[PDB]
Amino acid sequence: EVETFAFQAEIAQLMSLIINTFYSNKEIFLRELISNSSDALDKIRYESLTDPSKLDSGKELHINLIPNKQDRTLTIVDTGIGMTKADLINNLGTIAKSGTKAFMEALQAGADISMIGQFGVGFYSAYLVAEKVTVITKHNDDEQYAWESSAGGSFTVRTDTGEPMGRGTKVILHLKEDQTEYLEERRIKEIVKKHSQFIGYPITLFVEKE
């Protein structure tokens, strides 16, 4: 049921740079993932204007932030367009190869990690704070899939059997032991107000019952 794939060499080199560089400004990961969710919501909204049945899988367009201190996870959920199996296995890595190479150029010349988003590879900044990332996703045209990687040069894809989503994407960050500040409600609110105040969809921060 689970298929294992190698990352393309450039992506693998990027993930190793991100994991093993000393860089203290790690909070930018959350800005980049919210920006990704916003773009995904823009895309389904646009598609729905000429085919309203694209929203039959769900009319709400929003972003939820869900910390869980018991599992040490931070989950970002959106109801955007989602990703197909072809996206997860090939398309995303292929479009990213070009920006990755330029980002690794931009860096040695005189750039810092915070500009990662300008090269279209902001997703990989998740590995600043995560030892593992799980992505659950459902596109209109495909089934529900789970993607997972602890970096390491490989990732897995499997059909997901968990609770159905309808449509969209769930990024689950399994946080490193020393990065648990991003589970605190005060800290998340500081980052969102600082970096994402002008996002055009409701962002709901769920509170923990613990």
Ligand X SMILES: COc1c(C)cnc(Cn2cnc3c(Cl)nc(N)nc32)c1C
User: Exposed, middle or buried by CB within 10 Å (0-12, 13-18, 19+), for 9?
Assistant: exposed
How far apart are CB 110 and ligand X at their closest, in Å? 26
* 39 vs 71 by CB, closer to ligand X: 39
Q: Is 78 annotated as a binding residue?
A: yes
- Which residues here bind ligand X, judged by CB under 6 A? 36-37, 40, 78, 80-83, 88, 92, 123, 135, 147, 169, 171
Q: Which two tokens stand for residue 206?
A: 């769920």
Q: Is 123 annotated as a binding residue?
A: yes
Q: Is 97 annotated as a binding residue?
A: yes
* 37 vs 196 by CB, closer to ligand X: 37
How far apart are CB 36 and ligand X at their closest, in Å? 4
* 43 vs 194 by CB, closer to ligand X: 43
How far apart are CB 171 and ligand X at their closest, in Å? 6
* 84 vs 179 by CB, closer to ligand X: 84
Whole-angstrom distance, CA of residue 101 vs CA of residue 124: 14
How far apart are CB 210 and ligand X at their closest, in Å? 27
The arrangement of strands across the sheet holding 73-78 comes to 2-6, 154-159, 144-149, 130-138, 168-175, 73-78, 63-68, 203-205
Q: Is 91 annotated as a binding residue?
A: no
Q: Which residues are annotated as a binding site for ATP?
A: 36, 78, 97, 123
